[PDB]
Structures are given as C-alpha cells and as structure tokens.
Amino acid sequence: WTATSGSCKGRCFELQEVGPPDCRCDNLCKSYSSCCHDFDELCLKTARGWECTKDRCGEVRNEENACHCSEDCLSRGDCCTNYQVVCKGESHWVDDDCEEIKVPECPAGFVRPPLIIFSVDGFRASYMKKGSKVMPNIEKLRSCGTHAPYMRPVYPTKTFPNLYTLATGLYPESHGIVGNSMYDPVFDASFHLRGREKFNHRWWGGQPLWITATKQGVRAGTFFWSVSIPHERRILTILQWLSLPDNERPSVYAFYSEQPDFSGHKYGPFGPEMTNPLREIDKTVGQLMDGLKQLRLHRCVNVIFVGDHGMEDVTCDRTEFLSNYLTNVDDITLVPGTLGRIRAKSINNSKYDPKTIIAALTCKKPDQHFKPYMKQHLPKRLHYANNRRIEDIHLLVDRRWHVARKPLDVYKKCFFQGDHGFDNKVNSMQTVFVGYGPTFKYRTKVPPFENIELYNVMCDLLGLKPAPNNGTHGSLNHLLRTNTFRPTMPDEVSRPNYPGIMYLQSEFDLGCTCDDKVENKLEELNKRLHTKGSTKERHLLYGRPAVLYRTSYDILYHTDFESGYSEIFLMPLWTSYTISKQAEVSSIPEHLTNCVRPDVRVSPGFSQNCLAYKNDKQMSYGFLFPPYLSSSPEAKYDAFLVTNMVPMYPAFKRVWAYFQRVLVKKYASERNGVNVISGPIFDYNYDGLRDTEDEIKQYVEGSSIPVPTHYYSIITSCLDFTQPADKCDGPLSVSSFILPHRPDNDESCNSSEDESKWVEELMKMHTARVRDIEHLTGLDFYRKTSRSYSEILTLKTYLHTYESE
Numbered sequence: 001w002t003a004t005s006g007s008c009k010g011r012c013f014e015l016q017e018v019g020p021p022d023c024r025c026d027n028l029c030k031s032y033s034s035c036c037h038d039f040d041e042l043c044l045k046t047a048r049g050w051e052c053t054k055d056r057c058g059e060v061r062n063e064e065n066a067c068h069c070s071e072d073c074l075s076r077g078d079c080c081t082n083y084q085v086v087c088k089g090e091s092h093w094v095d096d097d098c099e100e101i102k103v104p105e106c107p108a109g110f111v112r113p114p115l116i117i118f119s120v121d122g123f124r125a126s127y128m129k130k131g132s133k134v135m136p137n138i139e140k141l142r143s144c145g146t147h148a149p150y151m152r153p154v155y156p157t158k159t160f161p162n163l164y165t166l167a168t169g170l171y172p173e174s175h176g177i178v179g180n181s182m183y184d185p186v187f188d189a190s191f192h193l194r195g196r197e198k199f200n201h202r203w204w205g206g207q208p209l210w211i212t213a214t215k216q217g218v219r220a221g222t223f224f225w226s227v228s229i230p231h232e233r234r235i236l237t238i239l240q241w242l243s244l245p246d247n248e249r250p251s252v253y254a255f256y257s258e259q260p261d262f263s264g265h266k267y268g269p270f271g272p273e274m275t276n277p278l279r280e281i282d283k284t285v286g287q288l289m290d291g292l293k294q295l296r297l298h299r300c301v302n303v304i305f306v307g308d309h310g311m312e313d314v315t316c317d318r319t320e321f322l323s324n325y326l327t328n329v330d331d332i333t334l335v336p337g338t339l340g341r342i343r344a345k346s347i348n349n350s351k352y353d354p355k356t357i358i359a360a361l362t363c364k365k366p367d368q369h370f371k372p373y374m375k376q377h378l379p380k381r382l383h384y385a386n387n388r389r390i391e392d393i394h395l396l397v398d399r400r401w402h403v404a405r406k407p408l409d410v411y412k413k414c415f416f417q418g419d420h421g422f423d424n425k426v427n428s429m430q431t432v433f434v435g436y437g438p439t440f441k442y443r444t445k446v447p448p449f450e451n452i453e454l455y456n457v458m459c460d461l462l463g464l465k466p467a468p469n470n471g472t473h474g475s476l477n478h479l480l481r482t483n484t485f486r487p488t489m490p491d492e493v494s495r496p497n498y499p500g501i502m503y504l505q506s507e508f509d510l511g512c513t514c515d516d517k518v519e520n521k522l523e524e525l526n527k528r529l530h531t532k533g534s535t536k537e538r539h540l541l542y543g544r545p546a547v548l549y550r551t552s553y554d555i556l557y558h559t560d561f562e563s564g565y566s567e568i569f570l571m572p573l574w575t576s577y578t579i580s581k582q583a584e585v586s587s588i589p590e591h592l593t594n595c596v597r598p599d600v601r602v603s604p605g606f607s608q609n610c611l612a613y614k615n616d617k618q619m620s621y622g623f624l625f626p627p628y629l630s631s632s633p634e635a636k637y638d639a640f641l642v643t644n645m646v647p648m649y650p651a652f653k654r655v656w657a658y659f660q661r662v663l664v665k666k667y668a669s670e671r672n673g674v675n676v677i678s679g680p681i682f683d684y685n686y687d688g689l690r691d692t693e694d695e696i697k698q699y700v701e702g703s704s705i706p707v708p709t710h711y712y713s714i715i716t717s718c719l720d721f722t723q724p725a726d727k728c729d730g731p732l733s734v735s736s737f738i739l740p741h742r743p744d745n746d747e748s749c750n751s752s753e754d755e756s757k758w759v760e761e762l763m764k765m766h767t768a769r770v771r772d773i774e775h776l777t778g779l780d781f782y783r784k785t786s787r788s789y790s791e792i793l794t795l796k797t798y799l800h801t802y803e804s805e
C-alpha cells in the first residue's frame with residue numbers, strides 16, 4: 001500500500017527514501033508505483049523543453065518551466081544547461097581547447113572533488129573510434145583525460161551482473177547477481193528483469209559504492225533512475241544536487257543511459273540506426289559538461305564514462321535448439337540466449353542425470369555453436385561457479401549465436417539483430433572506460449583492464465576504504481595523478497627448508513626404477529654447486545614465490561630448474577625454469593622412458609611412489625620441469641626425480657606433453673627466451689581459492705598423493721623482446737594458463753587429430769591472470785624485480801586474450 005495523497009512539494013528528487021505507506025518523491029518512486037500524487041506536476045516539468053533560446057534570456061521566472069533562463073537561475077541552480085552559452089556569450093565546454101587540470105579547481109566549501117559516474121548500457125568499445133565523428137563531447141573526454149582502448153566486462157556479459165560488478169568490485173558469483181534472470185533454490189524464488197522480486201535486498205550481496213560511501217560519511221546521490229525519467233531531467237537533477245549547501249550536498253553521483261543498448265538489440269551493433277543514439281548520448285554528456293562549467297565545477301569534478309558490456313550481431317536464425325539434441329527436453333529448465341543454464345524441471349524427478357545431458361550435448365554436430373560444461377569445468381578466468389544460483393550445467397554459446405530449448409520459444413516469445421552475454425574475452429563484448437578530472441591523468445592512454453578493478457579506484461577518488469573485493473588494489477594506480485594506493489607486498493607465512501643429501505638410495509621402497517647406474521673431480525664439484533643453487537639466478541628470475549599460508553616445504557635446486565616441494569601434497573607447489581631462445585629440444589632417451597629416481601634430499605615418507613601409479617589404472621604421471629628441455633644428457637637425469645613428478649590422466653598427458661615438447665620452445669623463440677613457472681592447483685570446491693588438505697576429493701588410488709584439479713603455467717619474458725628474458729632491464733610481459741586436469745578431452749571436439757590442431761586452442765580458452773593463480777595456490781609471485789610494486793600488480797592482473805585487433 002502507498003498513501004499517494006501526501007505531496008512532493010519541496011521534496012523533488014529527495015535523497016533519503018521514505019518508507020511505506022508514505023508516498024515517495026525520489027528518482028525511483030515510479031518503479032515502485034509509489035510516487036506522491038503531484039510528482040509528475042512538480043518534479044517532471046517539461047514546459048518549454050530543455051534549452052534556453054535568445055527570447056528567453058532574462059525572462060521573468062516561471063516555475064512551470066522545465067528549466068530556467070531568468071537572471072536568478074544561477075543562484076537557484078536550475079538554469080537550462082545551455083543558459084550561459086545562449087544568454088551570456090559563453091562557449092560550450094566541447095568547444096574549449098583542453099587544458100591540463102593539475103589541481104582541483106573547486107568552489108569554496110567543496111571538501112573533495114565530487115565523482116560523477118556516467119554509465120552507458122551496451123556501449124561497445126569500438127564505438128569510441130567508429131563513432132568519434134558524431135560524439136565530440138565524449139571524444140574530448142577521451143582524448144584529454146585518461147582512457148583505455150577497452151575495458152573487459154565480467155561474465156556473463158549481461159547488464160545487471162556488470163552494473164553490480166562495477167558498483168562492488170566483485171565477481172557475479174560473489175555478489176550474487178549471476179544473470180538478469182535467476183532462480184535461488186534456497187529462497188525458492190526467481191529474480192527477473194520484470195517485477196518486484198528484484199527489489200528484495202536478499203539478492204544483492206557485497207557492498208556497493210553508494211553504501212560504502214554512506215557508511216564512511218560521504219554522501220551519495222541516488223544511483224538508480226526510473227526508466228521514464230528523461231535523460232535531460234536526470235542531468236538537471238544532478239546539477240541541482242550539486243547546488244545544495246555543503247553539508248547536504250552529495251560527493252558521488254551516477255547517471256545511467258539505457259542507450260545504446262536499447263537500439264543495439266533492435267538494429268545490431270553497427271546498424272545505420274545506431275548513429276542517432278550515439279549522437280544523443282553525446283548531447284547528454286555535453287549538457288552535463290556545460291552544466292558543470294556553469295557551476296564552475298568543470299575543473300573540479302572527476303567524471304567517469306563507463307559501459308557495462310558491448311553488443312554483437314545475433315539474429316533469430318542463428319539459434320541452436322536443445323530439442324535437436326536431447327531425447328528428454330521436457331525434463332529440463334533452460335535459461336536461454338547468449339548463455340545457457342540447465343537444471344531439472346522437477347526436483348521430484350529421480351530419473352534426472354546431468355551426465356547423460358552433458359553427453360547428449362557434446363560434439364554432436366559438426367558446426368555446433370555452443371559447448372556444454374559442468375560449471376566447475378568452465379575456464380577459471382570466468383570465475384563463474386561458486387554460487388547456488390549458477391546451475392550445474394552451463395552452455396558456453398559461440399559469439400553471434402543463441403541457444404533455446406525448442407523452436408516455439410523463438411517465434412512464440414525475426415525482431416532483433418543484436419545481443420550480448422557471451423564470454424567476456426570476446427571482442428564484441430568489450431566496453432569503454434574514460435576518466436577525466438583533476439585526479440585522473442592528462443592525455444593518457446592506459447592498457448585494457450577489468451571492470452572489477454574500478455570499485456577500488458572509485459573508493460580512492462572519494463577517500464573511502466573499499467569493502468573486501470576482487471580488484472587488486474594498486475593495479476590501476478597508473479590511471480591516477482594523485483590518490484594512489486600504495487600497498488605493501490604480503491608477508492611470507494611459511495619459510496622454506498633447504499635440505500641437503502640426507503637419505504641413502506636403499507632407504508626408498510617406492511617401486512620405481514631407473515637405468516641411471518652409469519658413472520670425475522672436475523664435474524663432481526660442479527654438480528654439487530648446482531644442487532646448492534649455483535644456477536638459481538638463471539632459473540628463478542623474479543625471486544622465489546612467497547607461500548602465504550602455513551605449510552611445510554623444501555626448496556630444491558637443480559642445473560635446469562628450481563622448485564618449492566610440498567611435503568604435505570607430495571609434489572611441487574611451483575617449479576621455475578628459464579628457456580633461452582637458443583635452447584634445444586631433445587627426446588626422452590629409450591633407456592629412460594620409465595625412469596623415476598628417488599630424491600636423496602627428501603624422505604621416503606614425503607615422496608610419491610611408482611607402485612601407486614602402476615596400480616591406479618586411470619592415472620599416469622608427468623613432470624613439471626620437462627625432460628625435453630634438459631640442458632645436457634647428464635642434467636636430464638634430474639628431470640626424472642620423484643620430486644618433479646605429478647599425477648596426470650593419460651588424456652591430459654597429451655596436452656601437457658605437447659605444451660612441454662613443442663610450445664615452450666615456440667614461445668622462447670618468439671619472445672626471446674621465457675621463464676616458466678608451473679605447478680598444480682587444487683580447487684575441488686570451485687571457489688577459486690587454494691584447497692586445504694581436507695577438501696581434496698581424489699587421490700592416486702591407495703595413496704596419499706592428491707590429484708590436482710588443474711595445472712598452471714606462468715610464462716614471463718621481457719616486454720622489449722630485443723632483450724632476452726634472463727637479461728631484461730625494463731617491464732615484463734606475461735601470459736599464463738590454468739588447464740583443467742580432466743580424464744578425457746571431450747572439451748576439444750577435434751582431439752582425435754594431432755595435438756597441433758587442438759591443444760593450443762584449448763590453452764587459449766584457459767588463459768589466466770597471474771592473480772587467478774595466486775588465489776588458487778596461496779603463492780605470491782614477482783617478489784624480487786626491479787619494477788615498482790604497482791607496475792607488478794598491473795602485470796599480475798594482465799590477461800592474454802588471443803583476440804585480434
């Protein structure tokens with residue numbers, strides 16, 4: 001119930017929300033059907049439109065007007081935004097040459113530069129160049145301020161997941177808004193774009209920026225605008241709030257536009273109908289900047305122009321139907337479109353088996369335009385699994401396509417020509433970031449970055465302590481003139497042991513064998529030096545990784561590689577080695593095919609054994625440092641140490657062997673040497689965080705050897721590739737992966753072909769940030785470089801995406 005008989009007199013766009021049944025006058029009252037009877041009359045005035053004209057200049061004030069051109073309008077804070085241009089001979093902001101904003105130039109009584117976030121739905125990154133001729137205000141912001149060539153959204157690349165990620169710094173799996181449509185089986189409730197359930201606070205996790213601000217005594221504008229409020233009135237409302245007395249005036253504001261998304265769905269991303277919505281958004285930006293210039297705030301406010309996701313060409317005819325695959329299509333519920341999510345239609349159906357559904361959807365048609373996954377098997381970079389609202393079965397849909405349950409869903413719902421939602425590395429999904437103002441840099445291009453990083457920056461811009469989030473605070477310091485956040489490196493928690501030779505060969509009863517009983521004072525001291533770390537500077541280029549949790553581990557040195565060997569998990573946590581451009585690849589010699597050698601530095605009780613592998617008919621083993629890249633026949637024996645062995649399914653060994661034998665040398669050739677750090681990951685509860693021992697669900701049969709869920713590698717070289725990776729004076733370049741450790745290659749439909757036709761494709765799909773590996777391992781990399789720590793944080797957030805220009 002709402003008692004709509006109250007009045008909005010003196011309350012238009014009030015900031016504090018009044019509770020039912022009292023009627024409302026805030027910018028969301030329309031959405032709740034709760035506005036006072038006189039809200040339209042008083043708060044949504046439209047008389048005479050949005051612009052001053054010559055004949056209106058100096059007019060007697062008429063309070064009916066949408067905005068004013070009377071001499072008193074500046075003091076009232078309600079001039080039309082073009083008032084000073086039309087009436088006082090001033091220039092539009094866009095026509096002024098840009099001039100560096102070295103210091104905030106704020107009116108008296110301003111305690112900090114305000115922040116205005118100007119958010120645009122469906123604003124594809126390439127619009128900044130392709131539309132630049134029709135967006136002069138936006139082009140001025142971009143060229144004069146700080147901009148990225150694009151900003152990477154979160155998956156799914158839908159509106160509500162992304163706008164809430166922007167507001168909280170969190171992945172959708174953590175903030176809870178995992179789609180525009182959701183079912184929560186604990187609540188037994190459904191969230192939809194249409195209707196009232198979406199207003200219930202129980203859906204919305206984390207702590208969005210407006211709450212962070214309020215909790216720390218920084219006043220916020222209300223960020224949400226009912227759709228019927230015209231953009232011109234949104235801009236005027238912001239400018240009016242900026243005229244409030246100091247103690248009442250917010251410090252942070254948000255504007256939102258439903259365009260260009262609205263038109264992009266109808267016309268496609270580059271439909272000729274798209275030029276007008278881009279012109280109109282630019283015009284709104286110009287209104288805001290002119291309005292700020294009127295208030296003498298245009299060199300005081302920090303403005304962020306930011307999108308949620310891009311837009312791809314998608315038409316009704318490019319729809320895959322589950323009814324062409326499943327015998328039992330009426331037994332499932334599908335959330336459809338540019339991603340698929342599948343669950344049982346009935347929880348009383350005991351005949352429901354996700355395994356048979358996945359299998360029926362796997363590589364069944366030559367050109368199949370989606371791929372099914374159990375959510376834990378999705379690329380770890382998507383961070384899209386750890387939430388009860390994410391169905392166990394996910395379909396990753398190819399760009400330009402939809403999935404639907406049956407054909408009747410698509411014509412009893414072609415209209416549309418654009419959509420979004422796909423994998424967040426897809427070029428058409430990328431969106432925009434520009435920051436302009438005193439706290440941003442001047443005429444500065446920054447590399448692409450992820451939207452999860454912005455909350456921390458917005459907090460920095462407002463002097464707020466961010467709530468715990470998934471950004472890496474400091475990684476965007478290079479966007480900022482001032483207000484940088486200068487983190488300290490985390491403290492190492494576990495110090496390594498450095499074991500010497502402590503065990504005799506006969507103490508080991510591991511069931512292993514090796515043809516190494518082949519026999520010099522010259523070379524003997526030299527090999528002792530290698531075991532004490534004489535080559536470590538060559539192979540550990542950025543310091544040893546720090547272990548940020550409590551555990552027992554040993555540093556093991558060798559001619560060709562260094563490792564941190566876990567006595568708890570019976571295998572290395574990391575293995576580090578450098579491969580120069582000149583390195584040669586060799587075979588595993590015949591006599592060494594099945595060689596595994598006890599490590600006399602590590603007790604039998606803290607070693608793996610070969611017998612467990614012999615007896616486990618599903619599980620084989622691989623090596624972290626590759627025997628193929630040994631520096632000499634003699635050094636190759638180190639690569640067969642039991643302390644370099646890790647459990648690998650035979651199907652995964654196909655992947656791993658090709659990476660080690662072919663791809664590492666390829667990368668060294670291309671990048672002028674590479675440093676590689678490889679190791680296992682255990683994430684059985686798919687939370688993106690390192691498992692403890694008691695979370696491990698699978699072991700090599702009969703043994704205490706834990707089976708990794710993934711294998712990672714971090715591949716580092718010099719950004720200036722004229723310098724070799726091991727003699728790099730400046731910034732680094734990295735690419736990494738987190739490969740799923742799976743007993744089949746069903747993910748790769750072409751896996752019957754030579755690895756040259758499918759392995760690198762798999763690896764590209766499972767590309768990762770170093771930060772992703774840090775979360776999954778409790779390790780901290782790049783501890784000892786010549787580089788500034790914030791530069792290293794940026795490097796750790798880098799994702800190599802493998803998309804074209």
Ligand SMILES: *[C@@H]1O[C@H](CO)[C@@H](O[C@@H]2O[C@H](CO)[C@@H](O[C@@H]3O[C@H](CO[C@H]4O[C@H](CO)[C@@H](O)[C@H](O[C@H]5O[C@H](CO)[C@@H](O)[C@H](O)[C@@H]5O[C@H]5O[C@H](CO)[C@@H](O)[C@H](O)[C@@H]5O)[C@@H]4O)[C@@H](O)[C@H](O[C@H]4O[C@H](CO)[C@@H](O)[C@H](O)[C@@H]4O[C@H]4O[C@H](CO)[C@@H](O)[C@H](O)[C@@H]4O)[C@@H]3O)[C@H](O)[C@H]2NC(C)=O)[C@H](O)[C@H]1NC(C)=O
Pocket residue numbers: 170171173174175176202203204205206383386387388468469470687688689775
């Ligand atoms: C991305 O950044 C985020 C933010 O930093 C990281 O997420 C954090 O990770 C922590 C570990 O997973 C997690 O810490 C837990 O907090 C529990 C209390 O949580 C509540 O309070 C906080 C603070 O206000 C709040 O934010 C939480 O919000 C979650 O839950 C609500 C629903 O109530 C959602 O609306 C909201 O979206 C959010 O959901 C997300 O997180 C939860 C987990 O909290 C997931 O289940 C969801 O799927 C979703 O992803 C909560 O309101 C606290 O109880 C935990 O403590 C347990 O474990 C510790 C180990 O240290 C142990 O000491 C305790 O014994 C305890 O165990 C007991 O409970 C067990 C479970 O019932 C039981 O099995 C045991 O036997 C014990 O009884 C724990 O400390 C933190 O909540 C989240 N925060 C957020 C916002 O998500 C995230 O990891 C980053 N991601 C990456 C990849 O780095």
Ligand SMILES: CNC(=O)CCn1cc(CNCc2ccc(Br)cc2)c2ccccc21
Pocket residue numbers: 117119159160161163164166167209223224225227254255256258
């Ligand atoms: C038809 N209208 C809609 O669909 C409203 C959708 N919508 C608008 C906002 C808030 N405004 C945009 C915004 C978001 C973050 C920041 Br930081 C700054 C501005 C929002 C936040 C979460 C989820 C959905 C959201």
Ligand SMILES: [Ca+2]
Pocket residue numbers: 682683684685686687688689690691
């Ligand atoms: Ca985990």
Ligand code: NA
Pocket residue numbers: 612613614615616617618619620
């Ligand atoms: Na085996």
Ligand code: NA
Pocket residue numbers: 745746747748749750751752
């Ligand atoms: Na296959």
Ligand SMILES: [Zn+2]
Pocket residue numbers: 122159261262265420
């Ligand atoms: Zn859309």
